């Protein structure tokens, strides 16, 4: 097995332009979106069929109402922060909550907030405390730390409920979330400039998106340039790693790739 993760995001925007929702919420398991809700639709909807097929109407009805509540709270929380900073015009507020289930059976959980896309408040479920970045966040941290019951509720949700939800969704989407599509991996020679040869180790068609790619010699290599792990659009991913051949080296270079418990070596 590998790591799996459940994440819920909230975005709030003050004074949004025509059409753009003042509030948006999305859930993800790993890189897949599972749920969505916004201030315009005012409805929690599934973003994956294996969610849609396994969760009764009752679930979408109940969480619809919870999100209507959370939307109102978000609006009030943003308006208050703008008052504290003395900010007019449009600003953003963001929340991320989630857990990881690792293969060894162990877990993590996290909760944080951002103001204009920067870290504002981070939660520690072990010390039951909030890390604040400025005086205005310190202010919010104090109200929250005085409510011992709320901190305990958060710790419980992160450690037990989040993880139970994750294990339930992991079952519902096992065919998508627990499958392997092995990478097709090839090495291209390119004469980057006259008299200078670079090597390109390319992978594509793989899932999950986590992949280790390096160039080794005869011994890791320095001056490795990396492509990002990018979505192919069909639910698979592609990525590459390049090195440049120091002339009159004639050393033995090789591309190493690790994906989903399988190691590959392509020499040239």
């Amino acid at each position, epitope marked *: 097995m590998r790591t799996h993760s459940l994440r819920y995001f909230r975005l709030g925007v003050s004074d949004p332009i025509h059409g753009v929702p003042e509030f948006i919420s999305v859930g993800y398991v790993d890189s897949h979106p599972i749920t969505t809700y916004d201030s315009v639709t005012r409805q929690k909807e599934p973003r994956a069929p294996w969610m849609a097929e396994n969760l009764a109407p009752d679930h979408w009805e109940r969480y619809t109402q919870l999100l209507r*509540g959370w939307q109102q709270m978000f609006k009030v929380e943003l308006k208050r922060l703008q008052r504290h900073y003395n900010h007019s015009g449009s600003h953003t507020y963001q929340r991320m909550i989630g857990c990881e289930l690792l293969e060894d059976g162990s877990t993590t959980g996290f909760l944080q907030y951002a103001y204009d896309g920067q870290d504002f408040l981070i939660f520690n479920k072990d010390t039951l405390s909030w890390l604040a970045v400025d005086n205005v966040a310190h202010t919010i941290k104090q109200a929250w730390e005085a409510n011992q019951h709320e901190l305990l509720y958060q710790k419980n949700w992160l450690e037990e409920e989040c993880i139970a939800w994750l294990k339930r969704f992991l079952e519902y989407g096992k065919d998508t979330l627990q499958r392997t599509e092995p990478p097709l991996v090839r090495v291209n020679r390119k004469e980057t400039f006259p008299g200078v040869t670079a090597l390109f180790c390319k992978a594509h068609g793989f899932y999950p998106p986590e992949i280790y790619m390096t160039w080794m010699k005869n011994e890791i290599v320095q001056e490795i340039d990396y492509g990002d792990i990018l979505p192919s659009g069909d639910g698979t991913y592609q990525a590459w790693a390049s090195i440049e051949l120091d002339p009159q080296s004639s050393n033995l270079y090789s591309c190493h790739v690790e994906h989903s418990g399988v190691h590959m070596v392509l020499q040239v």
Partner: antibody, heavy 108, light 113 residues
Framework: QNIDQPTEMTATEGAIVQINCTYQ??????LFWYQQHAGEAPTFLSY??LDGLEEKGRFSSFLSRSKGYSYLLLKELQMKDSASYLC??????????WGAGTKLIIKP | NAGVTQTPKFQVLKTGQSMTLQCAQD?????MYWYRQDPGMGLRLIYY???????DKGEVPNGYNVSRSTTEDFPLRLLSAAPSQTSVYFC???????????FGNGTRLTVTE
């Protein structure tokens, strides 16, 4: 599914009473106790979500998650402790599931 | 703050009469609830509201309606009084879906033919 607490308990002033509440659920966001005097509104007493014991004055609240089990412990009983004690828990969907309540009678 | 103000405290109705129970809180609570309390069973949720602008059925919504035009008010309407509606009704509010409920002083209601 269910929550169970005893219909009535009777104890003597100055003594000790342990009001038990059992609950079956898959999913839990915590257990509350409310106090309701005859003719009056329920008022919040206690909240447990982690295992263990919280203490405020003469009142304690315990939770075993393992055994699906909470108690409200009242020490040094007074006549004014005479009331219904309402057991309740939040399921995964934040639905508030209420016990039928324990009527506590304190004998002078 | 007053907490939760619920009126009236008492009401008799004839079978088929219409009735509105008022409920208000000054506490900026998102969540408001209507419960009935009957001998030998737990509080039964009639309707709830997660915010101004939304409401939803509880466990025993039949024969009742609510509205939440404001943060403050959550009126409960009895459409057509039946004897089965003889009960004690409590309005409640909470800051959040997981936070403690503040209750009103209740409405003792009797429906007679």
């Amino acid at each position: 599914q269910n929550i169970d607490q005893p219909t009535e308990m009777t104890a003597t002033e100055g003594a000790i009473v342990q009001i038990n509440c059992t609950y079956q659920t898959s999913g839990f966001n915590g257990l509350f106790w409310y106090q309701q005097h005859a003719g009056e509104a329920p008022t919040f007493l206690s909240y447990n979500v982690l295992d263990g014991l919280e203490e405020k004055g003469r009142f304690s609240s315990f939770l075993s998650r393992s055994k699906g089990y909470s108690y409200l412990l009242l020490k040094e009983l007074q006549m004014k402790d005479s009331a219904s004690y309402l057991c309740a828990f939040l399921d995964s969907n934040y639905q508030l599931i209420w016990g039928a309540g324990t009527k506590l009678i304190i004998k002078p | 703050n007053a907490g939760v103000t619920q009126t009236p405290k008492f009401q008799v109705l004839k079978t088929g009469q219409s009735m509105t129970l008022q409920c208000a809180q000054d506490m900026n609570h998102n969540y408001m609830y209507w419960y009935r309390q009957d001998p030998g069973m737990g509080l039964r949720l009639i309707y709830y509201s997660a915010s101004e602008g939304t409401t939803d059925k509880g466990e025993v919504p039949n024969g009742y309606n609510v509205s939440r035009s404001t943060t403050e008010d959550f009126p409960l309407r009895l459409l057509s009084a039946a004897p089965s509606q003889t009960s004690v009704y409590f309005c409640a509010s909470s800051n959040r879906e997981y936070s403690p409920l503040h209750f009103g002083n209740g409405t003792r209601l009797t429906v007679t033919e």
